[PDB]
Each structure stands twice: as structure tokens, then as C-alpha cells.
Amino acid sequence: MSPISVVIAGYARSPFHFARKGALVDIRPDDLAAAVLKGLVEKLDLDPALLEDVVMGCAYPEAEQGMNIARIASFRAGFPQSLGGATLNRFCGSSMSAVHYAAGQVLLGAGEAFIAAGVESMTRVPMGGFNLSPNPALLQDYPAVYMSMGQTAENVAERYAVSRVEQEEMAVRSHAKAVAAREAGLLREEIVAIDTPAGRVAEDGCIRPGTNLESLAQLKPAFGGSVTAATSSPLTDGSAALLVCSEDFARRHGLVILARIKAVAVAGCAPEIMGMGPVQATRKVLQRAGLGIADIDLVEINEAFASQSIACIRELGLDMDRINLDGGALAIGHPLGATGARITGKAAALLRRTGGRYAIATQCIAGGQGVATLLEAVE
Amino acid sequence: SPISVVIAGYARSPFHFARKGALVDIRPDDLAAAVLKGLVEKLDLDPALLEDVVMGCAYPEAEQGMNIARIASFRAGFPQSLGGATLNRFCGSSMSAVHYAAGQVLLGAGEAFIAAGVESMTRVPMGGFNLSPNPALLQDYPAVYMSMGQTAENVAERYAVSRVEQEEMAVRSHAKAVAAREAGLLREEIVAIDTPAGRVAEDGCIRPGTNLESLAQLKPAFGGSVTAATSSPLTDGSAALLVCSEDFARRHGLVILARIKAVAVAGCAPEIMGMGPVQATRKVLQRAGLGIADIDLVEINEAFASQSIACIRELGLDMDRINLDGGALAIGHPLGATGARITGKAAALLRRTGGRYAIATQCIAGGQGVATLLEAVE
């Protein structure tokens, strides 16, 4: 007689690079995803034949991200044909929903170990895909369904009263925290270096040290309002992967357990303010875990925009000093499919490193959704 | 103390031929929405009670793009409070949508889900608009991109399924579909769809009086034993299930079709992807503590007569217990929607026939299988 325990027992990712001008422009997303899958199981010294399934998050699963990129990446990584592979699109939250899927399968007794990963080459598959075909009836009846992400960011800045200067202070803090993490070697363990035509890429490319209020105040508005390129996550290339498995499996294979998955959630919201997704998703995981915000040691909230990240943190009553401890997406980047796996893996790794008890990973999703994962330390 | 996960609803569009059938004018997001709306109207269920819509789709791009789960959900008039996520495991996408939903019920992450799928093989072509095979795998491992027809021939050769044996399954599949359709036994699962041309309420792919003599006169499709007629057709269609806790079904006075007792995925060699159901079925049996002897009926997808027959023999199943109301040869195979149809139909048949246990299982492009084992609710 034993509690069902689902744990994160591995977290790896590529460095994240600016789309179009960064170090990963020449790497196919299927090849990049493969590199990280192979990197994770090599960091763990884990036989991939022990895995049930690879679940790969991807916002635009077409073109080089098509043909079930989970299964393509798995083949390309040299993993056995006995694994399953599936690709999951919940846009910005895809690879956090991959974690929820794998967690559900562990409870169903349908396998003991999974990779929950994500990928986005925002260089090689442009945000929106090819052949964008909006529903004509929804364009007329419900146009907010297809609202630009930047307009949702302005809507939140207005409706939740987040000034341009307040957004710019988050940008300064997110870069300063990433720089401090990188320079202390605190991003090294999670990174799988990637071979490219130009050479080995081993370090994050989106961090801009010395980001400061005076230089930010000179930038042009991006969406005819308060938001700028610097208070918006950049177009990013990258992949992240987690090992999601039973506590028993991790113990059996001598794996270090980063954290236990204690509760999960999805919540819909109004598309016009999609950035507020995290509020209902976080309230759900607290209600399901039997916890309050005062119980949470740290939070990874994705910085899709400063406007929505700040509006969420205020609405939940979170201390900004407990947010995005090693930097957030303004600095680190936001390759859509990969972010959920990254912020979940990172929250787990930070909970273990900081000696905390509980953490939450949460983000917003285009089309009006939020996802959250509540993590618990393992003794 | 287990939570019990049930199927408490099954709806689908009529399934029609790609390019020449009755659904060619319906965008797949619109077709999925019609089925979502039909399902909740059949159940008289308020969709505000639903946690999430999980939509299977083999090619989630263009008219199937932009997270078709969420688009279909909005188009059906469901509240913004629901989640929406699109899942691609090609042929098995919407069975993996059931598996996802069942795990979320167990996690206590919601009590009611729609697990659905859609494919308009008319309006999004197989391979998508920008097929880009991994250059390294084209060199190292070309079988990854093997055509489904070549895998069907591989299985016919290696598992010794003659062209006549394949044609005998084509005959029985169509005959079984005609018996069901003629007795009104397909009507309850169907949501009629409005089209520019008028209301479509009947399946289009059934070819009544399909027979050995006429099949034997057709030309091979893949330089072997397989023909157009022993291959599932290119199909347009959508299917949706209500996957929910037993407590939620009882509380809302919903008729339960079946309990989900076990689930599985299993990888296999892409070059014989059609044998996916063997390891997937053996997994759900082992997990359920059951033998093939225990199973009253099976829905095994008829992607190809060759792989369906080869799997049925490998598992030692009585053909009389397979695809009671017809199989994909006759009903159609709109990739993203098939897993939800065969799981849904297997649950509905388990209830209608008074059996204890059923299996829904299928093969998947890229070498995978999926299986769901269902139990009658006492």
C-alpha cells in the first residue's frame, strides 16, 4: 500500500535563441527537439527503451513541425520504435499540457515513465503557420477569437492598470535575474548544447545585460499603446523536455527527483484578455492541492507580456520577489511549444535548489486559456 | 479508492468520401462544432459543466489550424471557461484524446471532458501543405516516411494475408454496415449536418452488395494484393465522446455506455505500422488482468484488410466478434475522428449487446497502436 506519486525526475532544454537573427536559425525543429530528447536521457544515464511515450508540445505542428514531430524527433534521437509519440497543441501552454497528459497516464497505470517536451522554431515555422484560414462565421460573430496577442496585451495594460514604466521595471528585473543566474552557472545543468553549422551553441541568446529604464523609454510602441518589443517575449527558437514518471520508477533507476506533481489545471478565459489565463488556472491548482497563495515558495509565470504577467501576479497577491527567480521569458525567450516544459522543469529544479516546499508553474495561452502545475518538494 | 472513468455520450457526423462525398463544402472546424453541439444537445447537458475539449486531428494546419479544439468549441457556442487542446497521433489522435481526458479525471483535474476528433481529408490533403521529411531520417531510416499502402503490402506478405482473405473482410464489413444501417442501428450516434446541398443524415461510404466476384476484378493499388476496396477510403467526418467520472454521469442522470478499465499505446516498426494493435491490445489485457477469452466484442480499425486480419489472427480473436456494425472499409476513416468513433461505438455496442468487456484498437502511421478496454457498468 503506497500513495500514487508522479514526479519530475529530469529537466533539459536547448539554449533559447532569437528567431531569424539567433544561433539556432539553421536547425530544423525536429532536429532540435531530437537533440534535447537525446540530451535529457544522456544527462540521466537512462535507457530510452524504459519510456512509454514521448509527448511533444508544438503551437504550429505543420511544415518542418509536421508529421507528428514527437515521433519524428524520437526516431531522430535514436530512441527505440517501442515508444509512443504524440504531438499536442494548446499554443503557448502545449508542453505544460504534455506534462498533464503524461501525469494522467501514470495514474491510469498506463506506463511508469514519459518524456513531456516541446519545441518551437519560430524562425522556420512562422507564428500563424502557412495558409492561415480563420473561420469566416467567427470573424464576423466573435472577432476576439482571432485578436492579435499584442492587442490582448494592451487590453490587460488598460483594464488592470499596468503603466508602460511598470512593464519596463519588469523587463529590467527579468534581464538582471537571468544575467545573475547565467553568470553563477545556474542555467548550465539544464542546458543541452546544440551543434550548428557555425559551431556549438551552449548559452542563451535572448538575455540583454544592462537592460535599463532610460533605454527602454526610447523604444517605439509595438501595438499603438504602452507595450514595446522589450515588454513582449521575443520570437524564439528552442526545445525543452521533462522526465515525468512514478516516484517508484525514479527511485528504481537512481534518478534525482526535482519535485512531485501535486495538482494540475486548465481554465478558459476571454480571448480579448488571454494574458489573464494564469489567475483561474492557479486558483484551480491551489483549490485541488488544498493550499493558499501564502503556501507557495516560488512561481514560474511565463512573461508573454509584462502587462499580463504583472496583472496576474497582482490579482493572485504574489510577492514579485518569489517570481521567475532565474529570469523570465522577456530575457530567456518564449519558443511557444517549448515554454510549458521549460517553466514546469525550471519551477521543479528551483524548488529543489532553494529548499522550498511548494511551487507553481503557470502561463497564458492564445485563444483565452491558462494552465498551471503545482509542485511539492520530495524529502 | 479508485475514481471510475466512463463514456457517457457518443456522437458523430455521417462519414462521407473525400472530394466526391456530401461533406466537401463543410470546413472541418465547422463540422467538429456541429458534432460538439449535437453531442451536448443529445445528452441535454449544459456545456458549462465541461472542463476541456480535446480534439484529435492528423493534420492540424490551414482549415484544421489555430487549435481547432478551441475554434470548434467557440463555433459550437460553448463558454470561454472551457479548455481546448488539439492532439496529433495521426490515425489514433482521438483515442489518445479519450486517454488524456481519462487521466485528467483520475488526477481530479475536472470531472467532464469532450474527447473528439475531426478530419476533412477533402480540405486538408494527407501530408499537409508543406510536407518536409527530415533529411537525416530519409538517409538513415527511410521507413519512417513509408507510404501506408507499402506498409499494408509488407503486412500482407509477412503475415500471409491473401488478396481473397482481404476481399472476404471487405465483403463482411460492407454487409455488416448495411445490416446496421438498415435496422436504424447507426441513426442514434449520428448528428445530421446542414450543407449548401441540404441536410446530410446518412453515411456515404457503404457500398451494398460489395462481393468476391466484383472485388477480384479490381487492379492492385500498391503492386501487390491490396486494392482500393481492401483499403479504407479518404473520408470527411467528426466524432465526439463525453468522458467523465461515474459520479458526474450519475449526478446528471446520463446513461453510461461503458467504464474505461484500461488504456495503452505501443510503438512498433513503421514498415508494418498495421500491426500496432497487437502490442496495444496485449497491454490493456495485461493491465485489466484479462485474456482475449474474456472480450465480448472488438472494434479494430480497418485501415487495411491485410493489417486488420493479421492483428485479429495474431491476437486469436473470433472474426464474428469484430466490428459488429461494420468497419472502416464500409464506414470510412477520417483520420483524426476514427479513435473517438471506434471507442464510442465499442462502448455503445457493449451496452446494446449486454456484454461484459470490449476493446477498441487501431494502427497508427509512424508505427504505433492504441487500445481502450471497456467494462459494462453494473
Side-chain angles (χ1 to χ4, degrees), chain B residues 222-234:
Chain B
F222 307 111
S225 58
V226 172
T227 67
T230 58
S231 304
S232 75
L234 304 182

Side-chain angles (χ1 to χ4, degrees), chain A:
Chain A
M1 197 196 308
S2 67
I4 307 183
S5 184
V6 188
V7 304
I8 295 164
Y11 162 46
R13 61 171 181 87
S14 67
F16 283 14
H17 271 81
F18 295 117
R20 288 178 308 107
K21 53 176 176 283
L24 294 179
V25 294
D26 286 317
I27 316 300
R28 285 177 57 98
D30 56 348
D31 289 333
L32 182 65
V36 172
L37 289 184
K38 180 168 170 167
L40 170 58
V41 297
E42 285 174 356
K43 276 176 201 293
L44 294 184
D45 192 13
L46 185 74
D47 184 355
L50 290 167
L51 298 168
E52 196 77 0
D53 193 14
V54 183
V55 191
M56 189 71 61
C58 185
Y60 293 100
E62 67 180 87
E64 289 179 8
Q65 286 169 356
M67 294 305 292
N68 189 6
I69 182 160
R71 185 55 163 176
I72 306 307
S74 181
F75 280 133
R76 182 64 178 127
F79 290 179
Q81 74 196 6
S82 61
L83 281 67
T87 303
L88 191 49
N89 176 18
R90 197 192 299 271
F91 284 135
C92 329
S94 298
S95 55
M96 196 181 289
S97 291
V99 174
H100 296 181
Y101 173 79
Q105 302 323 109
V106 171
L107 264 70
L108 282 161
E112 300 181 307
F114 296 78
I115 288 163
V119 59
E120 213 78 35
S121 178
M122 294 181 89
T123 298
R124 310 176 61 100
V125 177
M127 205 175 38
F130 300 109
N131 310 124
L132 177 60
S133 187
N135 189 102
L138 283 177
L139 266 182
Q140 273 293 308
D141 302 346
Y142 201 164
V145 164
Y146 297 105
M147 187 169 286
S148 75
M149 293 286 280
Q151 181 64 53
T152 76
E154 298 288 347
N155 286 348
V156 168
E158 297 167 7
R159 296 176 196 187
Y160 296 79
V162 197
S163 66
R164 171 158 176 178
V165 163
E166 289 171 337
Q167 296 167 49
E168 287 175 336
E169 292 158 8
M170 180 178 246
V172 166
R173 214 159 35 247
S174 176
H175 278 97
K177 284 184 301 176
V179 169
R182 187 168 60 186
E183 302 324 314
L186 286 175
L187 305 185
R188 285 191 59 103
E189 286 164 293
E190 73 199 74
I191 282 171
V192 174
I194 308 301
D195 293 323
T196 81
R200 181 175 180 275
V201 179
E203 169 184 271
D204 289 315
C206 301
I207 303 176
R208 283 186 184 102
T211 290
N212 73 87
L213 295 169
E214 293 205 345
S215 306
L216 285 164
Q218 311 316 312
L219 300 182
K220 306 332 165 101
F223 314 109
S226 58
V227 185
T228 68
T231 61
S232 303
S233 64
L235 310 182
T236 314
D237 301 331
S239 184
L242 297 192
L243 165 61
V244 173
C245 66
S246 67
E247 192 167 342
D248 280 352
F249 180 94
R251 294 310 188 207
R252 180 184 311 141
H253 295 286
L255 307 180
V256 173
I257 297 170
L258 300 189
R260 176 179 302 107
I261 299 174
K262 178 170 232 303
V264 299
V266 68
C269 67
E272 75 193 67
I273 51 151
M274 69 86 211
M276 300 311 301
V279 177
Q280 286 163 137
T282 299
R283 282 175 185 159
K284 285 176 176 196
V285 291
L286 291 168
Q287 177 262 115
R288 292 166 186 169
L291 295 175
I293 269 294
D295 293 316
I296 310 307
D297 291 293
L298 63 94
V299 166
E300 279 288 308
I301 175 159
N302 189 59
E303 292 175 0
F305 305 86
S307 61
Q308 63 78 26
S309 298
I310 289 158
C312 290
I313 288 163
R314 291 174 187 170
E315 201 69 10
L316 292 163
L318 281 166
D319 180 344
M320 182 67 73
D321 292 335
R322 293 179 188 283
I323 298 307
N324 298 344
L325 298 188
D326 285 359
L330 291 183
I332 298 296
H334 179 27
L336 302 188
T339 294
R342 181 177 79 86
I343 63 164
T344 308
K346 191 62 185 179
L350 285 167
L351 190 57
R352 183 176 161 263
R353 190 179 88 203
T354 65
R357 179 84 71 74
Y358 300 113
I360 291 174
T362 185
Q363 62 182 312
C364 62
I365 304 179
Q369 312 177 234
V371 281
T373 311
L374 196 154
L375 302 174
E376 180 178 53
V378 176
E379 291 291 324

